[PDB]
Structures are given as C-alpha cells and as structure tokens.
Design a protein around this ligand. Structure first.
Ligand SMILES: [Zn+2]
Ligand SMILES: [Zn+2]
Ligand SMILES: [Zn+2]
Lengths: 8, 229
C-alpha cells in the first residue's frame, strides 16, 4: 500500500 | 524533551526548529514513525513533509497554532509517498502554499498522492532554482540525485546544525537500506554522498524513520549503497 518503508 | 499532542510527537531540535513525528499502526507489523520539520522564521512557520494522513497533518497545524501561534507560509514535501505527502489536502484546506520537486508533482497521481500547488526545479549541480522557491528563508533545498526514489529532495536549515535527508538517509546503525524494490540502487551511494557535500556544516542529520543522528548516518547509507553496485 506504499506505506513508506512497508511496500504494502 | 518530547511533547505529545494527540497521536503526534514534537521534539525541539533548535531554538526555531522542531521535528514532527506521526505514526501509522500496521496490524502485525506495529507503529511506523515518520519525521518531518517545523521551522519558525521570524513571523512565519515553514513545514517540511506532511504526516501520514490529513487528520494527523491537521493536528500538526493545531500544535503550531498552540505552541508557535504564527501562520504557516509554506510547506515543502520531499517525495511522492504517503509518509511525506499523505496530508496535502489538510495543508491546502488551511490555505498553505505547497512546494514539491516537479517530478514529485508529475509522479503524484500514479503514487495516489495529491500534487503540491508549486513545482521546484533544480540546476545540474542539484541546488533548487531560486525563482521556483521564493521566500524559502533558511530552507536550502537540494536534489541529491536518485536514491530512495528518482524524485527525493533534501533540505538544510541555514544558521543551524540541521540537514534533513528524508527517506534517502538511514541511521548509522541500520542493518540494511530496507526495501530496494523501487530504489535507484546504481545512483543511491552518489546521491547520499552529494547530500553530505551539499550541507558540510550539518552535524545533526534528521531522517524520516530514525531519530536524529550524526554525519555517520550519511557515510553508513553511502557505504551500504556502495555494495549494491
Ligand atoms: Zn519513507
Ligand atoms: Zn518513500
Ligand atoms: Zn511507487
């Protein structure tokens, strides 16, 4: 989900 | 020396500079911090980066009204990801002029972000074209080259020890650069080193996902990036 350092 | 205000944290870094921190709780992964800057420049406030959300960004504006009580003249956002540009609608609803890299504004729709009102452009040496950044006061905007993203920009605060690397720079103790999926692994090291060379007097390096660090954060980021080439 493009949540900064989390790619989801 | 941290101040909590609802779900937000402010830490004074200098007489006229605060770090804002907002959190996104991911079920099973935990709360993820994102840091930006608030700068008091005479009779106005300048913001670097939104919070993750409009609601969180509104709470930053409430804290500024309560603790500083000066108008926010402008915000600059350092690339087109949720942690840096999630709150653009809250800034716009407050009548705040917003600035981003022209490339951030071009990528914004594809990234699900709202574009800034104004586009910054850069010389071949990475320094912002002054006419695209009018009245930025102590904010010195530098495009170091592609790394974390192709559009990532950085900001030094003139007259302070502070330079903001945003998501480009990792702390001096980081085990990795994190997710390299949409990174520019070829140019990352040189971009990290350019940020260092642009702000040689910065001894406090502020970054999106760690506490403020020494210039060792820059060297460590560059040396991790050297192993990708
Ligand atoms: Zn980030
Ligand atoms: Zn990012
Ligand atoms: Zn993307």
């Amino acid at each position: 989900x493009x949540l900064x350092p989390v790619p989801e | 020396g941290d101040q909590r205000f609802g779900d937000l944290v402010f830490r004074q870094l200098a007489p006229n500079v605060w770090q804002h921190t907002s959190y996104l709780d991911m079920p099973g992964f935990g709360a993820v911090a994102s840091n930006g800057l608030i700068v008091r420049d005479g009779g106005r406030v300048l913001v670097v980066d939104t919070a993750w959300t409009d609601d969180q960004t509104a709470q930053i504006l409430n804290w500024i009204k309560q603790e500083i009580n000066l108008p926010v003249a402008l915000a600059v956002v350092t690339h087109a990801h949720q942690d840096k540009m999630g709150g653009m609608d809250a800034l716009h609803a407050a009548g705040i002029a917003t600035y981003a890299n022209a490339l951030s504004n071009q990528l914004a729709p594809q990234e699900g972000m709202v574009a800034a009102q104004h586009s910054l452009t850069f010389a071949a040496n990475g320094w912002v074209e002054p006419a695209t950044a009018p009245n930025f006061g102590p904010l010195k905007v530098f495009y170091p080259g592609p790394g974390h993203t192709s559009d990532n920009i950085t900001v030094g605060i003139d007259g302070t020890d502070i330079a903001f690397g945003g998501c480009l720079i990792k702390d001096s103790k980081a085990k990795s650069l994190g997710n390299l999926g949409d990174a520019d692994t070829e140019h990352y090291a040189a971009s990290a080193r350019a940020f260092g060379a642009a702000f040689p007097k910065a001894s406090m390096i502020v970054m999106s996902h760690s506490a403020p660090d020494s210039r060792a954060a820059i060297t460590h980021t560059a040396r991790m990036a050297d192993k990708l080439r």
